[PDB]
Symmetry: C2
Subunit: 169 residues, 2 copies
């Protein structure tokens, strides 16, 4: 049926049984960090980077794209933490494999004509190169006037093969 | 200076040293699950819910809002086979504490007039109630024509006090 019904109830029971003192961590992130990472199932933005409960904000979307993450970032900065952004794109990203029009035409084949207008309004934010997408996203944020001027910003290629985060910008 | 320079290099070294057979997990998520969770630092969408590398997509934004997550979801479903969505909003969410106009006026106080237009274009997606925001996000996705009709969809309140995920819809 679902992961939610079958596996989750015991898995959380365990997480709760292991929950220790985490009950009393407050809202603003301790390390003043916002992670911007792709949503790829193989990446855990906690463990891959030594971050534990309460340390950093975890913003994740298809591709790990800054533009998409910007609203979350503005909130993370201006309301909470955070004067650090770490960008993580990864290797074998699903966003290397397609173009927005291809996706449009696909979803079009699986939904009524009355929703074609809707599909056609999604910028997917695909990229042809993992590292250039990192460079581009870092730069973007480094100049985005809605991001604070003192923000430290860096970008890493997560390698799904090694598990290594490799400094790109 | 930064978490990236000081603490990350050894933390990943460790994650890599512990990186067992995870090197060879492929792209499509194993459990066919997309998590939609708030970006709150105290929530780990892996451990809080027995999910490990390769199992599920992790889509995270300020509030854990579906509308914002929709583009990622369309990609997760149509490109990478996922017929489950679990929504997680949490308790002590930063999105309970403000309204979009308040945030606009704030960021306005910290940036040149020439960018007021930009600030003013952000719908922050605040909510007054944690559970209603879950109900609302679940329902929304349950009727969104761009989400596949067979998708199992559920919504949970993560409690930052207990660590418990509590079925809301």
């Amino acid at each position: 049926m679902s992961y939610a019904e079958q596996s989750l109830p015991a898995a959380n029971e365990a997480y709760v049984a292991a929950f220790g003192d985490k009950g009393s961590l407050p809202l603003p992130p301790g390390k003043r960090v916002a992670i911007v990472g792709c949503m790829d199932a193989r990446l855990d933005t906690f463990g891959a980077t030594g971050l534990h409960e309460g340390d950093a904000h975890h913003i994740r979307n298809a591709g790990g794209r800054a533009s998409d993450a910007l609203r979350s970032l503005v909130i993370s900065q201006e309301l909470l933490g955070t004067r650090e952004v770490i960008v993580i794109h990864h290797t074998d990203c699903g966003m290397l494999t397609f173009r927005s029009d291809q996706l449009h035409g696909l979803v079009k084949k699986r939904v009524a004509h009355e929703h074609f207008a809707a599909v056609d309004s999604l910028a997917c934010l695909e990229f042809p190169d993992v590292d250039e997408s990192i460079k581009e996203d870092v730069a973007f944020l480094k100049n985005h006037p809605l991001i604070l001027p003192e923000t430290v910003i860096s970008g890493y290629r997560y390698e799904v093969e090694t598990g290594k985060l490799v400094k790109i910008a």
